[PDB]
Amino acid sequence: QRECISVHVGQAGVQIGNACWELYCLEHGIQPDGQMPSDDDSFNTFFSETGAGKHVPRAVFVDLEPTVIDEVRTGTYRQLFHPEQLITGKEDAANNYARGHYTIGKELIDLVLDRIRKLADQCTGLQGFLIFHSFGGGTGSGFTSLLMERLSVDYGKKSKLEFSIYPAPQVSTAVVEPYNSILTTHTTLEHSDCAFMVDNEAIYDICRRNLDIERPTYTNLNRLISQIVSSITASLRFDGALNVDLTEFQTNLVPYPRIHFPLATYAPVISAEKAYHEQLSVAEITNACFEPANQMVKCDPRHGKYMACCLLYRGDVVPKDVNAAIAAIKTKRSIQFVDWCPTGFKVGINYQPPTVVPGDLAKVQRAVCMLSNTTAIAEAWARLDHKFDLMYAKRAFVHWYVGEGMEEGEFSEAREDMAALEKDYEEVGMDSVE
Amino acid sequence: QRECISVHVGQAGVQIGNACWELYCLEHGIQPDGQMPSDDDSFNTFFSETGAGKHVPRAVFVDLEPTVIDEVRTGTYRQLFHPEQLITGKEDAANNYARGHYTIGKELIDLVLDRIRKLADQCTGLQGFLIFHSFGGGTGSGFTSLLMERLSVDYGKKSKLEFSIYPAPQVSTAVVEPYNSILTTHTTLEHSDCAFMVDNEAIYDICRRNLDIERPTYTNLNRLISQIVSSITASLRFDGALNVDLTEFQTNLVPYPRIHFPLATYAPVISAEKAYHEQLSVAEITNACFEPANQMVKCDPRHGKYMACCLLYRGDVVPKDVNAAIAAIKTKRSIQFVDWCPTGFKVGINYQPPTVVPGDLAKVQRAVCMLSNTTAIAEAWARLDHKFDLMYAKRAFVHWYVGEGMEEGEFSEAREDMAALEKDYEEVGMDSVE
Amino acid sequence: MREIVHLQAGQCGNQIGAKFWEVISDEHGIDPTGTYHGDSDLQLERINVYYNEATGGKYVPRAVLVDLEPGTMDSVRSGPFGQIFRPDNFVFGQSGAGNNWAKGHYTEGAELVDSVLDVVRKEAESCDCLQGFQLTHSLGGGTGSGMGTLLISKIREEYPDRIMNTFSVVPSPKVSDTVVEPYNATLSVHQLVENTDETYCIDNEALYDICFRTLKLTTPTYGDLNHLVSATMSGVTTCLRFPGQLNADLRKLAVNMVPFPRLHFFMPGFAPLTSRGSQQYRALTVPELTQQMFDAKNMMAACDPRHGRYLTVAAVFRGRMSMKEVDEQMLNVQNKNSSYFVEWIPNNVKTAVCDIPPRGLKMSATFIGNSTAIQELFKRISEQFTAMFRRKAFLHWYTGEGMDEMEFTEAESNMNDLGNPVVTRGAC
Amino acid sequence: QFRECCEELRVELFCIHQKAVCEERKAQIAFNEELKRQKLVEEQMFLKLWE
Amino acid sequence: NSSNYGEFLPMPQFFPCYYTPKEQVFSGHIRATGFYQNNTLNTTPDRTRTLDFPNFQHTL
Amino acid sequence: AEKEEERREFEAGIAAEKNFQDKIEKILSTHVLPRNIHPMRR
């Protein structure tokens, strides 16, 4: 009765989804193939049922390039998925936002909207979409934004939560990253409705320092993201003392209509040979959330003010132990909140210990994801701005884009839009003096 | 509730920590790894009952040299501490208070301070941050400096005992040992509480006479130091007729707010085949406590006075036989006490009998830890100044400290305040004439 | 023969009302299946106030169970007294309430209010002499505030001569389970001023305060919280349910207890409250019942009575007790604490002593007090709303759903004009 | 209905669930150690291919 | 490396210990079958204040 | 009478406490609706 359609765009999205679905499958109990063990309504939140015991997910894997969909179609999940939902292109978007948005988008977008429409026809009440991608190459950015425009046209009253991998702030892995990222920022400011930021280097550091893994890999980097997405959209999957809805996340985290870029964190990232030594109680897992080395984005919260924080407790958690933890954390002067919001906390309770994939993480009795809408993300935005200004000073790498077909003015429009985002972040930054 | 972290910094400390903890466990119950062998609420103070009925230590073994800390995470107690707890550096603080309050330290100090946070957030009444650190090898001096300062700021009124090891009269195992002391007492005189200084030269002398051991090693000394640290923190981890917490020591021993440098001397330090010949009676133990050839610092009590002594007896101690002993002492004329301190010593009695780590200290059904603000530690303080003077004389072994920070001034600036300490002693011992 | 219809709105309202139905089912001797298994005929004598008769003695509660989320009534029906309600009372619809007063008052809530009202009608003309309606809801957050106030307005304009008892969980100072609680609660309080007759405000902070300080409980959960609400929820309506001397129904309380038509906000209290370890060290009687009753640590709302004057107060006692005890100790508490009681309203206590005590106890007492300590509760969330509203924050969903900027100013001006009389009564 | 309110049922449930967590962590520890053996066998394979 | 995402077959000692579900069979077989609607002609009796079916003996 | 009655009520309260303790140990004996265990186990 409550369910959301998962769309994965680009290698990033496809792979986050790889982990995402593996986790969902385990949680519910669905086996690889799709048939259940020798035997609930939780499968209604992500899967369907064919009347034959073959739960198929509401997933649309779109990529303009094969081998990343072909790994899925060859591997052990070839029968969980609908063999045609995995939409495959024939030409890579080439780290070109406007190739994924202007030239190779029209050979696939009609099929993608057709499959979104077919999935949404089998929907009682559609709570929203979950768009998984990066702010990187053309597949992750241009096809994503061109998808967002059509879902804004077709599903204008429908929620669209988003999980995006922000560019690495210090090193990165490509040279047109700021171009593509500011273009998709400009085209997803006005269409995306709540877009959770995940930086690679924060996952890198938390895996190195807390997970006691000196060899972490992308099989771990968004294996953590699978956990955090499940802990977000599990409150409509189970019951709780304080159950929270997907529209409740938006109405309690995005204060102005443009400020919809929260940063997240996970609680217990403890490392199997490490949790024989801590209480893992509610107070210290909340303190581990608010500690400035466990975030999803490399940005220091001390250079900014929190505006709205939603805590998602799953597991055997007491809401008045949560009361005690919040009363403890609101007295520390280091964690600064905005003054136009005397209470800025949401609590969500779910009676479900987290499922553990065979791998690095240990299971814990209590786990909270903290979703904060901070003013400190303007630091990362301005750093990417200096990045783009330094590259765009003399029209470097613009000839590819204007040769395939994007006009020169879209760069200036993206610059003006994200500078307006800078100004809005400062404007919600300073206090009230009237 | 009853609580007291132990921040062992430097080799001497870490090494002594090894002894102090070994003793704490065997006395309380925790098995090498933990999981109280069991078949009541002592551990609580100097431990933390985690999940699965575990027993984790309340400590942070810090030192900028792998060697030592490494031999802990590869030996008997490689399970008690939670890896993170023991923080270690990469390059040594080559005998230099500089490397401490200045270079190789600005880095690690950040973490140790954060780890101190968690070890104190899982508590409810920190009764004292016991800090064990020698007064020589850089680390012990410089690192402690940074720590003491930071703690004093955040954890304010909170007690801060520091069983530091005083430099040595003769012997000495460092030609720069002198410099560090006159630069480390410029921070233990303005950010400390009751730093109990103990000289290694005495435990040496005692080990030879009473303990009989002809050539015991370091471990043997650190173990005697354990009985002393134990006795002090035993009233806050067991029962007693006249208990005495750490706050009581500070508001009973230190007279004016800058004579926080008392001397300790254990009781029955007898040796198996020799204890079967004495009555270890309460009086007998205290008769020896004030003896001039058992004080744990060469400084002799004869050439000095007793500002205010503290006596903490342990084991079978009839509470109407201590008044007997204290009278049978204040009566004598040898022991002299400042006129400005009428009341003599403060009595402390606990039932829990001193435990025995199969080693040296034999079985004695009673004991006492004697503290005193003797007006004769000046002798040692002065011996130190001469060294600093004789050395700063031809600004020797100084190019180093001034190459790794520490403007030349420090030495001068501090040595003045060290001489200020001298006056304070030869001023509180002056005979009230008005 | 008298008659009360139970409205339950929102998740908090549904859970508290479910605990209420469990408590009075075990009081009347009704099993979960609906049949009667009791020991006293007085339980069956006045059973058809909460419990409509059916075929063969399967008494059905006359409660409607309302939420915009079709998830909490499923838990209610799976609960320990789930299989007792009529399934036509369960009204819902898959939509996003989103803790939003505009979304509970001007959209899908206003879509569902008609289908709610049809069931409320059927249960209202299936009556003999209706005393009125009793809504359980939480002011902080949506559904219970939005649809609750819309339902109160519609029921008041349909039947305007019946007593409305609204048990509201007002948001607490110390924490807040949702972030738009001032936004929801100023509008719901604005609507509760000029509709209802007896509001009962319950803070969660005071619930946990009586859970920790008085009950000495280690892990007090939401079930125990709603149980402590259900204690006074059941205890206020006992003289319309059971025999005894000095009977008092809801309108007798209301006329005896609201002086001016705006100051109808009340602080509940249930005070034979002892821990399991301290029960045996007690000499349970009416003087000590008065001591815990007028003690400010058994209160159910986070408002200290010693910063205000009591305007008027009731004790609904229950049990075989002498009445000289209650009369003389009400006199003695009035004489001992005089500056905290208003002098322009003398003899400002009420006593109503029903005979049947609750199970597991011999005597009990329900506290109702119209203290002027509601001042702090209103002023605090006035401050929070003004801080959230000066900077135009967390409100674009309201304006998208169809609010005007002028309506929030109307609500805040009305709640300040509710805080003005409680200023004036504190200084005559 | 007696399950849902006794509070010692809930404390004793905390106890059972913590014990189950501890035993499950032990099983996970064994599984990760088996992963370490598999990686060592991989390294020996690549060594002999290199030679 | 993408083969890791379906490998290590689930052991019968890896899952979370308990599963607290939100089962909508009640809403499932209520919602489609209406929400009740008062579409009838009234049958409520001639209810008075306190004298339902009185006696008028006091007359000539 | 009012004495003997009071003594009888106190004894009823003590016997009820005893029955509660026996009931609490019985229900903590080991207690699992198949629904509370995901197919993973059964």
Ligand SMILES: Nc1nc2c(ncn2[C@@H]2O[C@H](COP(=O)(O)OP(=O)(O)OP(=O)(O)O)[C@@H](O)[C@H]2O)c(=O)[nH]1
């Ligand atoms: N967990 C996980 N994250 C990934 C994976 N692949 C990419 N990412 C994220 O995606 C980011 C780059 O995305 P893109 O620039 O769009 O890569 P792309 O879509 O393959 O671009 P092309 O080379 O044109 O195919 C990286 O910085 C990663 O953070 C993956 O396989 N697993």
Ligand SMILES: Nc1nc2c(ncn2[C@@H]2O[C@H](COP(=O)(O)OP(=O)(O)OP(=O)(O)O)[C@@H](O)[C@H]2O)c(=O)[nH]1
């Ligand atoms: N009880 C005890 N004391 C020791 C031991 N080793 C050294 N000490 C004392 O510590 C003093 C110097 O050692 P430290 O200050 O610990 O040297 P460090 O911490 O390694 O400092 P760095 O040399 O800069 O690394 C000596 O004067 C000794 O009195 C030991 O093993 N046991």
Ligand SMILES: Nc1nc2c(ncn2[C@@H]2O[C@H](COP(=O)(O)OP(=O)(O)O)[C@@H](O)[C@H]2O)c(=O)[nH]1
């Ligand atoms: N006493 C009690 N309070 C509850 C319960 N459930 C929720 N609450 C309170 O209700 C408040 C918010 O509920 P609300 O947002 O109105 O739920 P909604 O009506 O579905 O939107 C929270 O602050 C909780 O403290 C319960 O079962 N008992």
